[PDB]
Amino acid sequence: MLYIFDLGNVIVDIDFNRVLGAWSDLTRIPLASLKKSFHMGEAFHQHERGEISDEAFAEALCHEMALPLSYEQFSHGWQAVFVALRPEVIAIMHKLREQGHRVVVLSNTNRLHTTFWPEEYPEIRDAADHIYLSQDLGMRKPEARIYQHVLQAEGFSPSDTVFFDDNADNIEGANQLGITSILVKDKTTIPDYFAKVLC
Amino acid sequence: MLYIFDLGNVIVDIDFNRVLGAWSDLTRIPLASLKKSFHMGEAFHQHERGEISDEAFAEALCHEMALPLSYEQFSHGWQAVFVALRPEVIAIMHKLREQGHRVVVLSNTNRLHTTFWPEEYPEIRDAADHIYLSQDLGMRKPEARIYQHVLQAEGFSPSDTVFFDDNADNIEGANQLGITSILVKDKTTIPDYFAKVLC
Ligand SMILES: [Ca+2]
Ligand SMILES: [Ca+2]
Ligand SMILES: [Cl-]
Ligand SMILES: [Cl-]
Ligand SMILES: [Cl-]
Ligand SMILES: [Cl-]
Ligand SMILES: [Cl-]
Ligand SMILES: [Cl-]
Ligand SMILES: [Cl-]
Ligand SMILES: [Cl-]
Ligand SMILES: [Mg+2]
Ligand SMILES: [Mg+2]
Questions:
Q1: Which CATH code fits A17-78?
Q2: Which residue on chain A is closest to B113 by alpha carbon?
């Protein structure tokens, strides 16, 4: 089988409130203002797809949120994002591979050239046959073209593919192509799914 | 009672391997070299006590580890340190206070002026009556003077004080003054200690 895993809130817990905390720490802007002004629109989509530079992405968010930061300062806080591995999921991924299943990661990424990001973590790279990243592809979930890129490059049909993601639009985008798509509700979805099938 | 909690590996999980990962990411220096060259000696003690500047501390570690980083780049990776709250411990701290016990934090800190650090987290500040930090005091655990500073400033005797820390030297330093010192072996030590006594 081909197994596709989302990264954010599937393989790792991730929390961008830490970043807002760090920008609040530096700017003294009340956290609540940053929480209110921080939202993922067009500049995110473009950055995810590599259509605008890190600097332009920084500039757009700083304009939205009235952040008087240099690019370096932006990056410095961006670096602070909370990321914890889910070791249960990592172990399952390793197990699937040694049973000759194909295991890959599919992630919309706002990594910057100056930051250390989950897709760069040795434990996540060593757990996957391949990692597919939006910025490299010029595509993002839930666009059909990104799922198709993966089926095509891995050589599997929709019906031989299982996809895990916590975002319901992402799940819909995959379903449209006949991928078996598992909504990740929380940390039990994936251990359950694989309970009997592994151990 | 006066309850004193260590921060690192007591209230929060903390992992500086994330920092080494980030410096490896930037420098391309193999992680294993950084792991081998990274050790907490005199420059740490001094920085903890506020005796040398952030820059000097950076300069010393970069010299030790052959890190060709600016101060900004050092800080940028330092910012990456893994920190997760232990919500069990945070809740216990809140509970102790509302029962009229005094609850404080005692931490040797290598915060920089440019970073967002656990002692600055709203959830940790809001959980404690007071937070005692090495850099502010010019003292560090396990020196007797730092424990004495806390007893003196809070107005409690050793025998009315309970201290939690995972470092055995820190625990010894407290014991020497007749503080009740609880070695934190793992994440159960503290929930157990308070199981019956709270709920
Ligand atoms: Ca990087
Ligand atoms: Ca700060
Ligand atoms: Cl992701
Ligand atoms: Cl202020
Ligand atoms: Cl994603
Ligand atoms: Cl498309
Ligand atoms: Cl600490
Ligand atoms: Cl390289
Ligand atoms: Cl400490
Ligand atoms: Cl002393
Ligand atoms: Mg996700
Ligand atoms: Mg500790």
A1: 1.10.150.240
A2: A26
